[PDB]
Each structure stands twice: as structure tokens, then as C-alpha cells.
């Protein structure tokens, strides 16, 4: 009925607790489940919704052959209630190989990019109808966050990039009210490559932690002022960098002004947020592959450059199990905003050659001020029992 302002303090986070799991790959050997990649959780004020970039096919299907491709005309954005697996009764809200969904408190906004790589169309759909569209401004490949956008007082911010993944790319921040782009803003600051941002509201603005694919093994931070439409950029000052291709803990570095130039040539989506001077950060256990996933808290990692003091480590996924994209989303509570993160679990080809498809499962954790324990939540599907 009314817009979302996120004008509540960020409550105390002593760690994270298990919230949800979708056993899509396990259920898909004896069932009808979509083949998906790049999911994200976005919550309306009543509940939480899971989103995925489907491939226009089920897993027990002939069209699951060669599903490793990322930009396909049959890809659609799948929407479900969080916990309901992606069965044949799901809703395809738009055509997209890149998407970003958010709720302003009144309706849903979906940003959906589809078409040719050289000439792509980003459609902005609000309240079930198409309200706007743009094309590529650099004609390389038009991409969005692949996570949730942030809406404050009816203004939603989407980070969209177009250009080389191994070079300079034009990154813009689009401010949209009710499906209509009211402003665009070029990226400004010290960040040199911004891709696949994970954004959370930090009142009165938005803070995004993104992925550098050119020279940075550390994560760039984009701060967005939604009233002045202004953008500033920096990097994370935590020495323990949070990108999948990275150096070991002894030789990693981040002075949060420039890319560290260590092994930044690729990465994952990733996420991080700030609690005072400290940083809560989730990364993969492996330093070269997307296997494993831990989360921890670095003391003075948002204020002191190159800080490697680590406390409160939780093993979300063990080293021997595959992981993937990870992103953030904020949930309004009774008196505070709580942070939560989703982790992808990629099962399929280019690592496992016993099958022909490539799909994912999702595990969702939420922060808590209370006591937690330890555990392990992998995908847990026997790849020899799968079609």
C-alpha cells in the first residue's frame, strides 16, 4: 500500500543461520524441474521469492544437452515462492539471460535483458506490464546485477554494464520510478570494472558490492545517492579478498583504492556488507575453483586498509562440494533490517562430464543476533543417478 523506505537501523549480526534450501537437482532425477542458473532471492513485504534464469527446458529432457551456454533466446526469468522448486507450474515473467527484480512495497519491478549480444534490449516491467525499454549503449553485451535491486521511496536503482569483461566497460546506474527510467548516471570513482553487483539499502542511499573481471581480486564498492543521483566508488579494505580467483591468505592484499592486480581476471558475484568498521563477507573456500563457501567477519575491514583479522567463521558449503554465485538481500523486521545471503550450488558440465546439462540448487541463510552452531549444506545429488 505504501512505499519501502528502509529507514530502520541494521540490527546486530553475530553470524548467520540456515533459512531455506531447494533440493532441485535431487528432485530433478525423479521429477520435472527446470534447468536454471544465476538465481537470487528478493522479498516482498509479505514473504520471499526465488528467481532463476531458466533455459527453456527441464532436466529429464533432450534439450538439456549443451546447457552450458549463458546467452540463449529461450532463457526466461522464473519466479516462485521461496522453498517451492522450479516445477512445470512456475511463472516466466520475462525473456532474459540477465535479470534484476525488486519490490518497492507496491508492485514488482523486473529488468530483463534479451536479444543479440551486439544489440540487446533491456525491458523494465512494472506491475505486470512493460513500462520501459532501452538498448545497448556500447553494443558489446548489456548486463544487469543478476541479483535484487533496491527501491527507496519508490525509486529503484539498477546497475547495468556494457563493454568488455577484460577491459574498460561503460557502467551506468539507472533510477526508475514505477517502471519508467527517470535518471541515468555514469559510474564515478576509483572502481575500474563493475559487474554483477549485490546491492543493499543503507539509508538514505544504496551500497553495492560487485565483481571485477579485469584486474581486481578484491571487490569494488559502489555507493549510490538516490536523491542527488550521485555515484562514488572504491574497493574493500579487507585484506582477505572475496573473489574466487585469488591469492592465498598470506599473499592477498587490498588497499581499497586500486585493483590489487594479483589474479583478477574472472570472479563470482559475491557479496559483502558493513557492520560499523567491520565487514561481513562470504567467499568460496577454494582459491582457484568455485568449490566450497565460507562466511566470516573481518575486524576493521571496512575502515583499515589491508586488514586480515578474522572472527566468526561459518562453513556454509564444504571444500569437497561445488558452489557458485552468491548474493545479498535485505529483509525488514519489526525494528531492524536483517541481511541474508543466497549461495548457488552448480551441478553439471565443464566440471562433471558424466552428464550433459548444467543446473543449480540454492541455499539461503539469514543473519541472527543469537547463537548458532556448525553444519554443512551442499547440493548432495548423486551425479551417477541423474539423467
Amino acid at each position, epitope marked *: 500500500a505504501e512505499y519501502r523506505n528502509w529507514s530502520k537501523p541494521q540490527c546486530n549480526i553475530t553470524g548467520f543461520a540456515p533459512f531455506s534450501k531447494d533440493n532441485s537437482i535431487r528432485l530433478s532425477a525423479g521429477g520435472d524441474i527446470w534447468v536454471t542458473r544465476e538465481p537470487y532471492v528478493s522479498c516482498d513485504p509479505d514473504k520471499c521469492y526465488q528467481f532463476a534464469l531458466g533455459q527453456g527446458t527441464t532436466l529429464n529432457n533432450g534439450h538439456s544437452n549443451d546447457t*552450458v551456454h*549463458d*546467452r540463449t533466446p529461450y532463457r526466461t526469468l522464473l519466479m516462485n515462492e521461496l522453498g517451492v522448486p522450479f516445477h512445470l507450474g512456475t511463472k516466466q515473467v520475462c525473456i532474459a539471460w540477465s535479470s534484476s527484480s525488486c519490490h518497492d512495497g507496491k508492485a514488482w519491478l523486473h529488468v530483463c535483458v534479451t536479444g543479440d*549480444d*551486439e544489440n540487446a534490449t533491456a525491458s523494465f516491467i512494472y506491475n505486470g506490464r512493460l513500462v520501459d525499454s532501452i538498448g545497448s549503449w556500447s553494443k558489446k*553485451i548489456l548486463r544487469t546485477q543478476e541479483s535484487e535491486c533496491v527501491c527507496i521511496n519508490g525509486t529503484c536503482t539498477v546497475v547495468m554494464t556494457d563493454g568488455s569483461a577484460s*577491459g574498460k566497460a561503460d557502467t551506468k546506474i539507472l533510477f526508475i520510478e514505477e517502471g519508467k527510467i527517470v535518471h541515468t548516471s555514469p559510474l564515478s570513482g576509483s572502481a575500474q570494472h563493475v559487474e554483477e553487483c549485490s546491492c543493499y539499502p543503507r539509508y538514505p542511499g544504496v551500497r553495492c558490492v560487485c565483481r571485477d573481471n579485469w584486474k581486481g581480486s578484491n571487490r569494488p564498492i559502489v555507493d549510490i545517492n538516490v536523491k542527488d543521483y550521485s555515484i562514488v566508488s572504491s574497493y574493500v579494505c579487507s585484506g582477505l579478498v572475496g573473489d574466487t580467483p585469488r591469492k592465498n591468505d598470506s599473499s592477498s592484499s587490498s588497499h581499497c583504492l586500486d585493483p590489487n592486480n594479483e*589474479e583478477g581476471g574472472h570472479g563470482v558475484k559475491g557479496w559483502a556488507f558493513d557492520d560499523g568498521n567491520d565487514v561481513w563477507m562470504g567467499r568460496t573456500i577454494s582459491e582457484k575453483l568455485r568449490s566450497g563457501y565460507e562466511t566470516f567477519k573481518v575486524i576493521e575491514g571496512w575502515s583499515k586498509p589491508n586488514s586480515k583479522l578474522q572472527i566468526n567463521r561459518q562453513v556454509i558449503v564444504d571444500r569437497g562440494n561445488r558452489s557458485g554465485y552468491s548474493g545479498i538481500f535485505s529483509v525488514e523486521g519489526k525494528s531492524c533490517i536483517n541481511r541474508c545471503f543466497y549461495v548457488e550450488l552448480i551441478r553439471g558440465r565443464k566440471q562433471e562430464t558424466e552428464v550433459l546439462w*548444467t543446473s543449480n540448487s540454492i541455499v539461503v541463510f539469514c543473519g541472527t543476533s543469537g547463537t548458532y552452531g556448525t553444519g554443512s549444506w551442499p547440493d548432495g545429488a548423486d551425479i551417477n543417478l541423474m539423467p
Partner: antibody
Amino acid sequence: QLVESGAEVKKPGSSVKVSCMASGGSFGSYGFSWVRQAPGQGLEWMGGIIPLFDTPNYAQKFQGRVTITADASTSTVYMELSSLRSEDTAVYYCARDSLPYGDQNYYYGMHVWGQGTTVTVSS
Amino acid sequence: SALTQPASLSGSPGQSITISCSGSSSDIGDYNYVSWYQQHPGKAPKLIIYDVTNRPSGVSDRLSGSKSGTTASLTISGLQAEDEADYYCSSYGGNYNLVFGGGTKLTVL
């Protein structure tokens, strides 16, 4: 199928341009690579380019000498080698990935190979 | 170069020959992107193995690939006369760089 330019003789200190065009379908998102083979020696990877992004990558031993350009509409890649020396006599191949650029396909895979061009640099 | 290989190998028609390719951690090791190419004299290189174990269509099933720690192996089972060639190993060293190995000259007797 990758067509390539003709063999050209050169003088030391000059500059040579090699061209390779993919006939195929449309390959702009695909990654092209340039490989040098000295007569009798092995294969060395000069560099690569995605014609759509137009941001080349070079080997450490070739940074400063090789310029790689591309035309995405024609999917034609060009390699300019300047300051030709004695040990630039070789056969140059252009290879291309069988899959387009993606999250799981970022390294320059080299699946389809061209016929090659010889460059002779001596006098 | 960065990846080491046997200078030459020999075998009899009918047996199996394994070609090794060793490297550092930034080389074959992590980043399991290892390709094997086969070159006959006077012709362009031909991809026979990509992604450590996978094999392109049109390549004989007698060629197989494997990885152990920091080395890769190419196994040719049932040597014939058409398998006499130069075999090369390449890997992805990171930061958009590919590293080759000095080729081996497989000759059947």
C-alpha cells in the same frame, strides 16, 4: 572454416599484417587466438581477442610488439607485427573457440584452426 | 616452454603410449583447462583433447586424457600408422594467458 591471407616476404625492421576471416555464421562473441610456430620449433601463443569486446590480451614476451585488431561485423581478425627481426620467420595460425564467451567459457579455447601464413623476415 | 614434455617417444603398433605434461601450480594443477593438440608434418594443429578429459566429435576414441596433481597425461591405446605426429599440451595460466608445452614427436615402429 577460417580463411587466411597469403604468404608475404619482408625486410628486417618492417611491419607485417596477417588477416584471418571466419566464414561460418556470426562469430563476434567467440575468442580468436594467434599462434606462432618457428620452423622446427614448437607453438607459442601470441595472444587473443574477442572481436565483440575489442580488448586484446597478449603474452608477456609479446607485449609491445604485436597489435591485434578485429572487425565484429565481418568477424575478421588482424595481427600487425612491427619491427620484424631475424627470428620472426615462422608460420602464423589463427584459432577460434567452438563456444561463445560466457561465465564458464572465459579462457581462449582453441578448437577450429586456420591453415596458416608464412612470414619470411631476412635480407 | 612453461609446460614440460618428453622430447620424443616411440612405440610399437598395438601398444599404448602415455605422453606426460608437467607444470607448476599456476600451470596444470588448479584451473583444469588442459588441451592436447596433434600436428602432422606440413599441416595445421588439430585439437584432439579439450578440458582435460573431453574429446571433440570426429576424433578417434583411442585418444584419452587424464590429470593427476600437477601433471596431465594423454593415453593413445592401439597405436596405428596415422598416430605418428607432434603432440602439444596447453593450459590456462590465469589472467587471460595460455601456456604451451614443447611438443613430443610420437613415432610408431
